[PDB]
Amino acid sequence: VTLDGGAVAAPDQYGAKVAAEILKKGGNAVDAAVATAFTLAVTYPEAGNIGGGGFMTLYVDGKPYFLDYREIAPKAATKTMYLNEKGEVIENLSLVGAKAAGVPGTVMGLWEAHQRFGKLKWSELLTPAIGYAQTGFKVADQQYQYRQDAIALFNGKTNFGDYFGTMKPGEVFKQPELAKTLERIADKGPDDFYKGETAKLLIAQMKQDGGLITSDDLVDYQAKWREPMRIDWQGNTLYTAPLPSSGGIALAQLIGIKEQRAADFKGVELNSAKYIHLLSEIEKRVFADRADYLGDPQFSKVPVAQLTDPKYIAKRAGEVNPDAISATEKVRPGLEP
């Protein structure tokens, strides 16, 4: 569809500027997404990343796609690795330090998306991010506040302060080591991150910090294309994340149940008490199912069809109490007889 231009909604001004520059010169949405994701790995390091993972939903040439570049547990991970001699969760062991990390997927994900749909040269799409790493970006006030929260959590148990200590609100923050890493990725793609110099540095940090990630974990990492979750209502088609996201199943249930209960929503104003109560009653059932059934779909037989069947959605919608809070103890996973 020839639209009146392209568009970007980005979480900061730098991702927006880069995406727009890519589109303006004739890159496609995937080219722009690659450049933007690497840019935010520099400018929005609280969340944009090359050391994490994520999901991409795409609509290309009228066809829906989904790319899963979620991290995987290291091969040396074990069910009780975060429990102590009492069998209790060790405070912050799954949140702070090297044993908290899954195998990163982002570089592989962006590569796979670009290989399949990109129009512009990979190395050129990294140049904006390299520039922001070399010559800097302006730290935001909210970003600094998140930094302070993280410093409180890390409490001197990691090397965070040695690299992000100079992040100060309103001031330009440069990242020369990351710039060199992005240059290697520009030249070698995932080969640098999973098999090359960056891999070696990651492994060395694991050795230094007692982590679990090994060269085997990195060379075995694969992003996965999956069929997106499809939800139809009122003539619209929503494509969203399937498992290992819980959001697709949740949205299928939230939308389906709300539609089933249209008579109870009729005339109810947005964010009135009744409206919020109704959403909460729906959310009770969604989270009951999420906790009991959902996980990586290749590691158990997850009953996706049963949990999204229209007859099941109708049954769960029947549980919603429009006038009072349902007893929490009586909210059960919906397939339990």
Partner 1 sequence: TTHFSIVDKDGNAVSNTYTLNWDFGSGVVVKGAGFLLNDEMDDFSSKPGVANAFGVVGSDANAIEPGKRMLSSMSPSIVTRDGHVSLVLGTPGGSRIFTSIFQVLNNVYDFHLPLEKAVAAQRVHHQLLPKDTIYYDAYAPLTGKVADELKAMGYTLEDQGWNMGDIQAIRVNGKALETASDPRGRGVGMVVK
Closest CA to 216 of 190, 195, 185: 195
Nearer to partner 1 (CB atom), residue 71 or residue 309: 71
The verdict on whether omega for the bond into residue 244 sits within 30 degrees of 0, i.e. cis, is: yes
Binding of partner 1 at residue 53 (CB under 8 A)?
Answer: yes
CA 187 to chain centre: 26
Q: Are 26 and 36 in contact (CB under 8 A)?
A: no
**278/301 Cα distance (integer angstroms):** 31
Q: Contact 109/69 with Cβ under 8 angstroms? A: yes
- Rounded to the nearest whole angstrom, what is the least distance from the CB of residue 120 to partner 1 in the complex? 12
Does residue 84 touch partner 1 according to CB under 8 A?
A: no
Rounded distance, CA 189 to CA 124, Å?
A: 12
Count the residues of the shown chain that bind partner 1, applying the rule CB under 8 A: 161
Please report whether residue 308 would count as binding partner 1 according to CB under 8 A: no
> Can you tell me which residue has the tokens 């697709």?
248
User: Least separation, in Å, of the C-beta of 311 and partner 1?
Assistant: 21
Q: How far is the CB of 314 from partner 1 (least distance, A)?
A: 18
Exactly one of 85, 170, 236, 267 binds partner 1 (CB under 8 A); that residue is 236
Stretch touching partner 1 by CB under 8 A, among 58-66, 120-128, 310-318: 58-66
Among positions 137-196, residues that touch partner 1 (CB under 8 A) are 140, 142-143, 146-147, 149-150, 153-154, 157-160, 162-164, 175-181
**Closest Cα partner for 36 from 16, 60, 58?**
16
The single residue among 214, 245, 260, 308 that binds partner 1, judged by CB under 8 A, is: 245
Query: How far are the Cα atoms of 284, 285, 326 from residue 329, in angstroms, in the given order?
Result: 11, 12, 9
Confirm if 161 and 151 have CB atoms less than 8 A apart: yes
The alpha carbon of residue 176 and the mean position of all alpha carbons in its chain are separated, in whole angstroms, by 26
Segment near partner 1 (CB under 8 A), from 2-10, 122-130, 304-312? 2-10
**Considering only residues 128, 194, 284, 317, which one is a binding residue for partner 1 as defined by CB under 8 A?**
284
Residues 13-52 that bind partner 1 (CB under 8 A): 13, 15-17, 19-20, 23-24, 27-30, 32-33, 36-37, 40-41, 44-52
State the DSSP H helix or E strand holding residue 173, giving kind and residue range, or none if neither. strand 172-173
135 counts as binding partner 1 under rule CB under 8 A: no
Cβ atoms 213, 200 nearer than 8 A? no
125 binds partner 1 (CB under 8 A): no
Among 38, 99, 114, 183, binds partner 1 (CB under 8 A): 99
Binding partner 1 (rule: CB under 8 A), the pick from 188, 287, 304, 319 is 287
- Asked if 241 touches partner 1 (CB under 8 A), the answer is yes
